[PDB]
Ligand binder design. Structure first.
Ligand SMILES: Cc1c(NC(=O)c2ccc(N3CCCCC3)cc2)cccc1[C@@H]1C=NC(=O)C(Nc2ccc(C(=O)N3CCOCC3)c(N)c2)=N1
Length: 265
């Protein structure tokens, strides 16, 4: 619904390519740092996104990467978002592995959990929560990126649960078996994200293929406790992986659990 005037955007740097194509760093009206997705023709269900984009812009929280506005009067369309100078969390963890204290790792989990509790309170699903889809700003704050955009991807390798781009390693059994998305499937993904954080960016179920991961988690295999996770922290991430969705906590409960560990530490 905020239709940004493209004349107000100055492109400054190439940030790379994602599922929707080229992303650039720029400024709005010469001042505000933004990231700009240039949506590659054919990569996105565009009429569907435009019809629904206002709901996503209305999601406002300090730990969400803001979707500020769109440019849809031309092609390619633009999606204008909050710029995050330290890039995606996955690379941030891997590039600074020897600099983190365990207190900082728990704070990253708290940042993400606060954003997800807000989304949960709006009955809004992320659907592709993972360290690769969190970003880090210049002061080390972690924020959740591209919530809700998974629904608009046009790429059978990503939308099929047996495709090579589907986020199998972050998916609960009921997503892999039935495509049943809910707040509780975001909960499962959050647990895997906690594991990514405390493993300093290792790949979950490394050496397993996607289908081997699906087979074995459906039979009860679970990710081991990372060395840097205390047992209290591991209990929190493990609670996200109950086979039955209704036995998984809410993000409200997870946040309370994380704050309790902080107060104890
Ligand atoms: C997001 C994204 C993608 N990806 C998508 O667009 C996308 C993802 C998933 C999708 N899926 C479908 C929809 C649902 C989810 C899954 C769809 C699209 C690709 C390129 C860039 C970006 C962003 C966005 N905003 C930023 O602020 C940012 N910032 C920085 C800052 C510094 C750097 C940097 O160079 N360095 C770091 C600092 O030290 C030096 C090195 C960098 N590389 C990036 N990059």
């Amino acid at each position: 619904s905020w239709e940004i005037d493209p004349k107000d955007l100055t492109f400054l740097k190439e940030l790379g390519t994602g599922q929707f194509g080229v992303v650039k760093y720029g400024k709005w009206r010469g001042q505000y740092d933004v990231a700009i997705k240039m949506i590659k023709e054919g990569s996105m269900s565009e009429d569907e996104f435009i019809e629904e984009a206002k709901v996503m812009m209305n999601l406002s929280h300090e730990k969400l990467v803001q979707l500020y506005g769109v440019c849809t009067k031309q092609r390619p369309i633009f999606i204008i978002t909050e710029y995050m100078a330290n890039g995606c969390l996955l690379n941030y963890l891997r590039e600074m592995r020897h600099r983190f204290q365990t207190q900082q790792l728990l704070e990253m989990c708290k940042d993400v959990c606060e954003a997800m509790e807000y989304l949960e309170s709006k009955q809004f699903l992320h659907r592709d929560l993972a360290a690769r889809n969190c970003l880090v700003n210049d002061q080390g704050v972690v924020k959740v990126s591209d919530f809700g955009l998974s629904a608009y991807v046009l790429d059978d390798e990503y939308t099929s649960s047996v495709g090579s781009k589907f986020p199998v390693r972050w998916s609960p059994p009921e997503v892999l078996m039935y495509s049943k998305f809910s707040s509780k499937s975001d909960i499962w993904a959050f647990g895997v994200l906690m594991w990514e954080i405390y493993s300093l960016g290792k790949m979950p179920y490394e050496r397993f293929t996607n289908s081997e991961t699906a087979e074995h988690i459906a039979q009860g295999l679970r990710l081991y406790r990372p060395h840097l996770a205390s047992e209290k922290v591991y209990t929190i991430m493990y609670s996200c992986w109950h086979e039955k969705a209704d036995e998984r906590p809410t993000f409200k409960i997870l946040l309370s659990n994380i704050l309790d560990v902080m107060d104890a530490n």
